[PDB]
């Protein structure tokens, strides 16, 4: 599908509210496998199961290993911009 830019607002006591799978070491993008109900990703409205996370706050995630992506994603605070695509 088309590449989308999506804004997520997270409070500091929260996680993102997603499960991710995949990573470069598996030859698969960082993929959203779960959107947890009521948590920030669900609330933002624009992130969905099956979306590949291409970048977050300008950090490319296309070639990142799984754990690299976890570190990068979990670092982000407040108003967080995602670049995603549903394939």
């Amino acid at each position: 599908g088309p590449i989308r830019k999506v804004l997520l607002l997270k409070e500091d006591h929260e996680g993102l509210g997603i499960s991710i799978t995949g990573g470069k070491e598996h030859g698969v993008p960082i993929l959203i496998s779960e959107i947890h109900p009521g948590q920030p990703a669900d609330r933002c409205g624009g992130l969905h199961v099956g979306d590949a996370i291409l970048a977050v706050n300008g950090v490319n995630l296309r070639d990142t290993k799984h754990k690299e992506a976890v570190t990068i994603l979990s670092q982000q605070r407040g108003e967080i911009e995602f670049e995603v695509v549903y394939v």
Partner: peptide, 9 residues
Amino acid sequence: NSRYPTSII
């Protein structure tokens, strides 16, 4: 199990 590892974040 997921096809590949999964992390909740």
